[PDB]
User: Fold Envelope glycoprotein gp160 from Human immunodeficiency virus 1.
Amino acid sequence: EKDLLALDSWKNLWNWFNITNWLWYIK
Assistant:
């Protein structure tokens, strides 16, 4: 129950990119 595409384990990578956090200053 832990393949490579385990969305439960990928959720960590999708949260890694916090562009909305550093993008707050691009506007």
